[PDB]
Symmetry: C3
Subunit: 99 residues, 3 copies
């Protein structure tokens, strides 16, 4: 079973998050630029997206929180959604970031 992780964090935290995940065996991710409103009325943020095996989700979340948590407003948000199919277009094999 696969899951999707969506992480909304400050733009300048990309490198740190990437290397932290790479250290635990997770490398394939998608990144997009978005505007964050809530806590002009908005600030630029980046949305990091990855799809991986359910058993790898907990460690991935912990590592993201570790590099992004500072204790004050705006540290970001992490969402986990169910994925019914994860396909690697090349072979039809499963697309797992945790491989």
């Amino acid at each position: 079973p696969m899951k999707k992780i969506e992480a909304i964090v400050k733009p300048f935290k990309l490198d740190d998050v990437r290397e932290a995940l790479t250290e635990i065996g997770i490398t394939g991710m998608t990144v997009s630029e978005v505007k964050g409103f809530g806590r002009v009325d908005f600030l630029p943020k980046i949305k990091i997206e990855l799809v991986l095996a359910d058993d790898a989700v907990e460690r991935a979340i912990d590592v993201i929180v570790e590099v992004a948590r500072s204790g004050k407003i705006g540290d970001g948000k992490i969402f986990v959604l169910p994925v019914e199919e994860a396909i690697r277009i090349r072979t039809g094999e499963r697309s797992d970031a945790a491989v």
Copy 2:
């Protein structure tokens, strides 16, 4: 239990949607620029994303439809997806737009 709302609407409807949601206690959202094809062959749209408590979803949908529904083609689309985890990076508490 949390849910995710994805709303695809015309770019110039952002302000109206934001204030309408703020009026019912929903403020934290993410916004991204996308191209909409379907009904050049595309028009710029904005994708509004929010994660909130399941009990707040119905009212949120109704308010979005209220400000965006005009009766003619292109009013937009609203999708609801299940969320298994909603985490506020700062404390590990739940990330609820409806608070």
Copy 3:
């Protein structure tokens, strides 16, 4: 029951994918620009998003793989996620790409 398809493919494959889906009755889609890391450390990609009836998912996936599969690294990824509500803002009717 509705489902969401997220397809991450090379930027120059948009036209081919669009026409292939149009040939099988699927037209409404959203497209966004993202950065893909994994297999500078990234390359521009496009994320194609569509929400359609569960019975239309298999054929849609097959057609996307058909036009994008080349046999070598970077062909892309396809994810399927559950959708609890798909609403056409205009009438409140269901938003189905497969109509």
